[PDB]
Design an enzyme around this catalytic site. Structure first.
Site, PDB file in Angstrom:
ATOM      1  N   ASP A 345      47.004  35.284  40.223  1.00  0.00           N
ATOM      2  CA  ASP A 345      47.218  36.638  41.043  1.00  0.00           C
ATOM      3  C   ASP A 345      46.013  37.169  41.461  1.00  0.00           C
ATOM      4  O   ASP A 345      44.683  36.597  41.036  1.00  0.00           O
ATOM      5  CB  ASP A 345      47.933  37.599  39.918  1.00  0.00           C
ATOM      6  CG  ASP A 345      47.978  39.035  40.395  1.00  0.00           C
ATOM      7  OD1 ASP A 345      47.210  39.836  39.643  1.00  0.00           O
ATOM      8  OD2 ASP A 345      48.624  39.259  41.365  1.00  0.00           O
ATOM      9  N   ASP A 686      48.382  39.820  35.617  1.00  0.00           N
ATOM     10  CA  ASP A 686      48.132  40.933  34.859  1.00  0.00           C
ATOM     11  C   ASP A 686      49.522  42.204  35.003  1.00  0.00           C
ATOM     12  O   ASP A 686      49.750  43.020  34.518  1.00  0.00           O
ATOM     13  CB  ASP A 686      46.970  41.795  35.290  1.00  0.00           C
ATOM     14  CG  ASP A 686      47.031  42.567  36.686  1.00  0.00           C
ATOM     15  OD1 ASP A 686      46.474  43.622  36.867  1.00  0.00           O
ATOM     16  OD2 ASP A 686      47.569  41.800  37.549  1.00  0.00           O
ATOM     17  N   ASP A 690      54.237  38.895  37.571  1.00  0.00           N
ATOM     18  CA  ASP A 690      53.502  37.559  37.252  1.00  0.00           C
ATOM     19  C   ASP A 690      54.646  37.140  35.934  1.00  0.00           C
ATOM     20  O   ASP A 690      53.867  35.882  35.718  1.00  0.00           O
ATOM     21  CB  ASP A 690      52.097  37.814  36.938  1.00  0.00           C
ATOM     22  CG  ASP A 690      51.279  38.089  38.013  1.00  0.00           C
ATOM     23  OD1 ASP A 690      51.338  37.839  39.160  1.00  0.00           O
ATOM     24  OD2 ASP A 690      50.392  38.930  37.796  1.00  0.00           O
TER      25      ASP A 690
HETATM   26 MG   LIG Z   1      47.963  41.909  39.607  1.00  0.00          MG
END
Ligand SMILES: [Mg+2]
Ligand SMILES: *[C@@H]1O[C@H](CO)[C@@H](O[C@@H]2O[C@H](CO)[C@@H](O)[C@H](O)[C@H]2NC(C)=O)[C@H](O)[C@H]1NC(C)=O
Ligand SMILES: CC(C)CCC[C@@H](C)[C@H]1CC[C@H]2[C@@H]3CC=C4C[C@@H](O)CC[C@]4(C)[C@H]3CC[C@]12C
Ligand SMILES: *[C@@H]1O[C@H](CO)[C@@H](O)[C@H](O)[C@H]1NC(C)=O
Ligand SMILES: [K+]
Ligand SMILES: [Tl+]
Ligand SMILES: [Tl+]
EC number: 7.2.2.13
Lengths: 992, 39, 268
Positions: A345, A686, A690
């Site tokens: 990410d 995070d 995700d």
């Molecule tokens: Mg992120």
């Protein structure tokens, strides 16, 4: 099952408000009926998420109790009770042998079960985190009246109302809104507030303004909407199910364990039954044939090995806990070392997740600011009088403020009330000009025009802090081009000057460069109003232009971005030097995604996409050979219409990949694509978007401070300080533990031979039993334990970060080279050293080696209390047995003595001990404690009854010393050959 | 000695055990010292 | 094939052949040096045989000799072992002045034939007639068990002195030259009868010390025949034969350490 959920969603934001009501039998104004709502409740079911069916801990514990070694140990434990039963019936045996050994072995299975159970842990509460995102209550309009209801009682069709501060209770079709902004970070990973209005604004429902989603929250304003989806049927409720439902799967390390279990189990059953028949042919009673088999089992199974592995893993996880890297699953300690591909990410992972000033354009010059958290860069400018003029506008023409009580925390980390761009500017000036509040006290704001959608600028009028003036200063900021159309002069190095086409072109150049860097650019200008035309009491009208907004002085430009974390660029390069492929997978827009890719080193300098080639050469993209482009940037909207085979080609054909504007399922798809090619993949993230990717990853790593609760539930590892450098450490630790496990496994296995061979010679030679079953467990469960563990503290023999990731198909934890060395070479030398001490004890008591062949018959005969030795003396039954058990004791001690050398040689696979040294203090501890244990077991009074351990005479301890030394020399000579010729012979045969 | 050679069929297993246990203990202490050089 | 090519399969064979060959040659070498440190006449250690064991001829199934008097093949098992032992004490086996000698027909003192050296031929052993074993096919009813003291090189069995009280209080106490053997069971439902050298219920000290198989082959150890003409029948009788001496001791674990454990039962 979940293949449906891996697909992009379909919606009804294209319909008119009225049309949408027909579909759900609803009223736009009155809302649903109390009766119709209750009807729909029973129909569709609750607005809730149901957690997936889990496997109870019962079945999880017992599933370990039947994995190769435990199976063989069970056969042994029962075969003990078998021989015991056969005894209790035939000849009354007042002994406790088979009974107790059967109890001991069954305990070994249970305790070993706890260790593997502890290792195979799965702490997963994905669906629980998602459930936490549904509010307890919602506001609905029913029978023309608004009331709060249990959010689970919400159904498709009713009229819902939301306002700043509340969670979206369900997927809504916006029908009415007033200044409504929403935080869609759940779906994108980006927290910038998105406007919501009844008007349809994009074919893509995840981008349109007239849809609001469950799992997100309203940040400001008010909105009303019609519920289109409830519970599991919402967009993120499906993501929930997908994430929670995904099959976990076996880790690389787990697969390795099972693999050597098969090997060792194989040789165990081989020699087991190979000698069981070999005994019956020799005319051994089934009464004995089983007793020998039990011994064979105990000899072949390394009873303490699986627990060693677990402890070595645990100890490695403890070291990483001490670097702010929490491991939730013990096996994930190794996966990072076997990782060949990282899918990362961007926002809050690679980046700080905070709009930060990156560059400034003043004095016809591009200046760069420091974007790093801890400010590890340098200054750009302080001297120029222009800077102070720009700095003043950035502070004054700004409505952002620091939250109360932050004075303790660093400037860049403190919470700010305001939009991202104003916060960035605030923190920029506060950093390099001190307290901004001071600047806003010295220059009292009298009138302002806040940033308007139409004006595209924000202006402010302040009392000049200067005493010799104390007059009125005008400042404004906005779109760079709009600010330009309002300027006549430019503050160059202090003094103003006319805005000639020259500087105007340099402005465009500066503007295009900063924008090319993926940075948001703002214009800044001011105007010192004429004193005579503006008295100390002159009133300014903000509603109607009461003051000039043209012919102003352009001061400068400022650019900003959500920047990389300080450690990220260097960590990315380090991953790439270790031969790990790094891919970006983000919900963010392509221009931003690509710019950070270059910033952190995902896309290296000079590498191009097909679009880059086309623009440079000024040719159509179809005219570009796509193989000329090693880098690519794929938008989620295009990803959606590509098959997996085509996704596989993208993955194969590019070294530098950026997947931008991806949905959560799309991240999962990219991860699966990488895995499909046979790669071990790590995910770093995070956000809740995700979660599926983190779950599917061989190892998911979540950010600890910036991470959402969901992401950290889906992960195997948490970076508690958001230190991306920890990934580099993790892969290094992962590789080191993999090598050290080999060392520890070889060490443990080596001592199997000296435990097997005595039982074989007992049959083939008909001599007294050299070593007992109990004695074997004193080794594998006792003496070898701490030494075997200590190998986990071995330093690397070379630069492990310099080698490519292991091939999980070829590079195994236990191979033929390990068995050849442990079983065929070193263990064989240990066996002899054991036998030697055995012959020494017997010969010094009167039974010379020659007379021992074929004597067991009379030796074991309990009724012959007069066996003749070589010297013509006569021994009772218990007398000769004391010597025999003393033989078991010295054979045992011989193993310990030969394991001294083995411990030192297993220290290194390639290097010499004279190179690697003896700096492992745990290992040295192992040597001392091992010897202390052995001595205690021999000399402690009463141990001759509980374990049949007898006191050894001083000379006995030294029997195996010459064999212990030969091991050290042999292995040192062998490894000397390895190093001296990387060719292959010694290497391809014995190099673990 | 002659008929008084009883010492030939005797061994001080008691002292050996005392010494053996002393050694085991001291090796145990030495080990702790080296391990505790940093914890 | 399975692992490698033929060339590799060969090389792995040439290695392990030379390797295991060397290891065998080294193992043998260490056995050589071990033997080189040992005497041919006397073992390095003797503390593990120290207190002599007492063993008998009737091969006990489990320290027991039960049979039926009214049955032939009921005791023919115990007569096999009884014969095996006494068959060695034949007069035809003890012929000429070599290597046997006529010793006192009455219990006498020790006999030292020098040291444990080969500086002399085969050390001459005292003759022993099985004819000294009065009354004892063997006892078809009420067995005639034969006792024996385990041989230990250089061991001088020393009888107890009549300083204080004794079990068989002072009766036929040949204090200076006899190692006594008194069998017992309370539970006194038997009839102990002992036979031996000089008619004494012990071992004549003139058969000591034993010089070992290498320095004294054909050597004969003294026997003590014991007959239990018990007037009882059809019950397990736990009879323990105990030897007494200065160098004689016992153990709760080793039930043969200078004593017997016989469970006679004439179930007829
Ligand atoms: Mg992120
Ligand atoms: C040792 O003495 C025994 C005494 O019983 C010998 O047994 C003789 O066996 C022969 C042939 O089987 C019989 O004819 C005799 O009746 C037995 N007794 C005697 C006194 O001669 C036995 O043969 C002898 N063993 C050796 C090796 O000489
Ligand atoms: C007690 C004694 C008689 C048993 C001796 C067993 C010997 C023959 C065994 C023990 C370990 C064995 C070796 C272990 C490892 C390998 C490597 C593998 O790629 C091929 C077989 C090979 C080379 C084995 C051949 C046979 C071997 C050398
Ligand atoms: C033993 O045999 C002798 C003859 O040799 C006989 O006189 C005597 O009665 C027997 N003794 C016993 C107790 O039966
Ligand atoms: K995972
Ligand atoms: Tl083992
Ligand atoms: Tl082992």
């Amino acid at each position: 099952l979940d293949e449906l959920k891996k697909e992009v969603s379909m919606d009804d934001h294209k319909l008119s408000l009225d049309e949408l009501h027909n579909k759900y039998g609803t009223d736009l104004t009155r809302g649903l009926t109390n009766a119709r709502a209750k009807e729909i409740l029973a129909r569709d079911g609750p607005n809730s998420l149901t957690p997936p069916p889990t496997t109870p801990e019962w079945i999880k514990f017992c599933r370990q109790l039947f994995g190769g070694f435990s199976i063989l140990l069970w056969i042994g434990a029962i075969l003990c009770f078998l021989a015991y039963g056969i005894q209790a019936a035939t000849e009354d045996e007042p002994a406790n042998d088979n009974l107790y050994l059967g109890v001991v072995l069954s305990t070994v299975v249970i305790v070993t079960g706890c260790f593997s159970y502890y290792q195979e842990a799965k702490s997963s509460r994905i669906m629980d985190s998602f459930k936490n995102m549904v509010p307890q209550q919602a506001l609905v309009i029913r029978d023309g009246e608004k009331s709060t209801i249990n959010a689970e009682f919400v159904v498709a069709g009713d009229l819902v109302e939301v306002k700043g501060g509340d969670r979206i209770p369900a997927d809504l079709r916006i029908i009415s809104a007033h200044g409504c902004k929403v935080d869609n970070s759940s779906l994108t990973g980006e927290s910038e507030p998105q406007t919501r209005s009844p008007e349809f604004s994009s074919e893509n429902p995840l981008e349109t303004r007239n849809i609001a989603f469950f799992s997100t929250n309203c940040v400001e304003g008010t909105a009303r909407g019609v519920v289109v989806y409830t519970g599991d049927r919402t967009v993120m409720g499906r993501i929930a199910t997908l994430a929670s439902g995904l099959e976990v799967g076996r880790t690389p390390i787990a697969i390795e364990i099972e693999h050597f279990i098969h090997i060792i189990t194989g040789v165990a059953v081989f020699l087991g039954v190979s000698f069981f028949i070999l005994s019956l042919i020799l005319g051994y009673s089934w009464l004995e044939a089983v007793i020998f088999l039990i011994g064979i089992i105990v000899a072949n199974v390394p009873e303490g090995l699986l627990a060693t592995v677990t402890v070595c893993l645990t100890l490695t996880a403890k070291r990483m806990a001490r670097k702010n890297c929490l491991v939730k699953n013990l096996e994930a300690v190794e996966t990072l070392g076997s990782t060949s591909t990282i899918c990362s990410d961007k926002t809050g992972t690679l980046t700080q997740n905070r709009m930060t000033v990156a560059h400034m354009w003043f004095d016809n010059q591009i200046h760069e600011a420091d974007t790093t958290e801890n400010q590890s860069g340098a200054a750009f400018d302080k001297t120029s009088a222009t800077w102070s003029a720009l700095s003043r506008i950035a502070a004054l023409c700004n409505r952002a403020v620091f939250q109360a009580g932050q004075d303790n925390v660093p400037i860049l980390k403190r919470s700010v009330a305001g939009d991202a761009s104003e916060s960035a500017l605030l923190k920029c000036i506060e950093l390099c000009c001190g307290s901004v509040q001071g600047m806003r006290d010295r220059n009292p704001k009298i009138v302002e025009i806040p940033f308007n959608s139409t004006n595209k600028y924000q202006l402010s009028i302040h009392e000049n802090e200067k005493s010799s003036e104390s007059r009125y200063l005008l400042v404004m900021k906005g779109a760079p081009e709009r600010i330009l159309d309002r300027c006549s002069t430019i503050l160059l190095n202090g003094a103003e000057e006319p805005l000639k086409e020259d500087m105007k072109e340099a402005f465009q150049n500066a503007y295009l460069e900063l924008g090319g860097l993926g940075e948001r650019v703002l214009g800044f200008c001011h105007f010192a109003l004429p004193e005579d035309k503006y008295n100390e009491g002159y009133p300014f009208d903000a509603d109607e232009p009461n003051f000039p907004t043209t012919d102003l002085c352009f001061v400068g430009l400022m650019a900003m971005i959500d920047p990389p974390r300080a450690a990220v660029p260097d960590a990315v390069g380090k991953c790439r030097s270790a031969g790990i492929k790094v891919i970006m997978v983000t919900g963010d827009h392509p221009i931003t995604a690509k710019a950070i890719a270059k910033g952190v080193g995902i896309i290296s300098e000079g590498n191009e996409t097909i679009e880059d080639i086309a623009a440079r050469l000024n040719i159509p993209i179809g005219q570009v050979n796509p193989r000329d482009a090693k880098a690519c940037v794929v938008h989620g909207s295009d990803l959606k219409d590509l098959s997996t085979e085509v996704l596989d080609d993208i993955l194969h054909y590019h070294t530098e990949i950026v997947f931008a504007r991806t949905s959560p399922q799309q991240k999962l798809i990219i991860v699966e694509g990488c895995q499909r090619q046979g790669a071990i993949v790590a995910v770093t993230g995070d956000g809740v978007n995700d979660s599926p990717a983190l779950k599917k990853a061989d190892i998911g790593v979540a950010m600890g401070i910036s991470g959402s609760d969901v992401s950290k539930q889906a992960a195997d590892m948490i970076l508690l300080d958001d230190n991306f450098a920890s990934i580099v450490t993790g892969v290094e630790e992962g590789r080191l533990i993999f090598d050290n496990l080999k060392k520890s496994i070889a060490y443990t296995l080596t001592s199997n031979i000296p435990e097997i061979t005595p039982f074989l010679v007992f049959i083939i030679g008909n001599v007294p039993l050299p070593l007992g079953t109990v004695t074997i467990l004193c080794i594998d469960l006792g003496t070898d334990m701490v030494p075997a563990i200590s190998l986990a503290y071995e330093q690397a023999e070379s630069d492990i970060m310099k080698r490519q990731p292991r091939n999980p198909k070829t590079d195994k934890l236990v191979n033929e080279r390990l068995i050849s060395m442990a079983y065929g070479q070193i263990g064989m030398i240990q066996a002899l050293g054991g036998f030697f001490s055995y012959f020494v004890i017997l010969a010094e008591n009167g039974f010379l080696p020659m007379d021992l062949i074929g004597k067991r018959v009379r030796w074991d005969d309990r009724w012959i209390s007069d066996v003749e030795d070589s010297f013509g003396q006569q021994w009772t039954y218990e007398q000769r047995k004391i010597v025999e058990f003393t033989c078991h004791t010295s054979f045992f001690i011989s193993i310990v003595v030969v394991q001294w050398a083995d411990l030192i040689i297993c220290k290194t696979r390639r290097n010499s001990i004279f190179q690697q040294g003896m700096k492992n203090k745990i290992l040295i501890f192992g040597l001392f404690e091992e010897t202390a244990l052995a001595a205690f077991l021999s000399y402690c009074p009463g141990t001759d009854v509980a374990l049949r351990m007898y006191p050894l005479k001083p000379s006995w301890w030294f029997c195996a010393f010459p064999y212990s030394l030969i091991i050290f020399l042999y292995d040192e000579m062998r490894r000397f050959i390895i190093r001296r010729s990387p060719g292959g012979w010694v290497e391809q045969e014995t190099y673990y | 000695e002659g008929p008084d050679n009883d010492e030939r069929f005797t061994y001080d297993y008691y002292r050996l055990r005392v010494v053996g246990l002393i050694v085991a203990a001291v090796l145990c202490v030495i080990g702790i010292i080296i391990l505790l050089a940093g914890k | 094939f399975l692992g490698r090519t033929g060339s590799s399969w060969f090389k792995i064979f040439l290695f392990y052949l030379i390797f295991y060959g060397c290891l065998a040659g080294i193992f043998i070498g260490t056995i050589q040096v071990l033997l080189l440190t040992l005497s041919d006449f006397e073992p390095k250690y003797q503390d593990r045989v120290a207190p002599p064991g007492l063993s008998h001829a009737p091969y006990a199934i489990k320290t027991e000799i039960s049979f039926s008097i009214s049955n032939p093949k009921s005791y023919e098992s115990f007569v096999k072992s009884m014969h095996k032992l006494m068959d060695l004490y034949n007069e035809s086996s003890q012929a000429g002045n070599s290597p046997f000698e006529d010793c006192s027909d009455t219990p006498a003192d020790y006999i030292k034939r020098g040291d444990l050296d080969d500086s002399q031929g085969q050390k001459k052993a005292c003759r022993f007639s099985r004819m000294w074993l009065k009354n004892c096919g063997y006892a078809e009813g009420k067995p005639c068990v034969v006792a024996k003291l385990n041989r230990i090189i250089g061991f001088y069995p020393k009888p107890l002195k009549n300083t204080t009280d004794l079990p068989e209080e002072l009766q036929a106490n040949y204090n200076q030259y006899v190692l006594p053997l008194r069998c017992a069971a309370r539970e006194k439902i038997g009839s102990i009868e002992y036979f031996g050298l000089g008619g004494y219920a012990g071992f004549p000290l003139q058969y000591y010390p034993y010089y070992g198989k290498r320095l004294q082959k054909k050597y004969l150890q003294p026997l003590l025949a014991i007959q239990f003409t018990n007037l009882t029948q059809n019950m397990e009788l736990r009879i323990e034969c105990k030897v007494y001496g200065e160098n004689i001791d016992y153990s709760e674990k080793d039930r043969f350490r200078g004593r017997f454990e016989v469970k006679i039962e004439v179930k007829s």
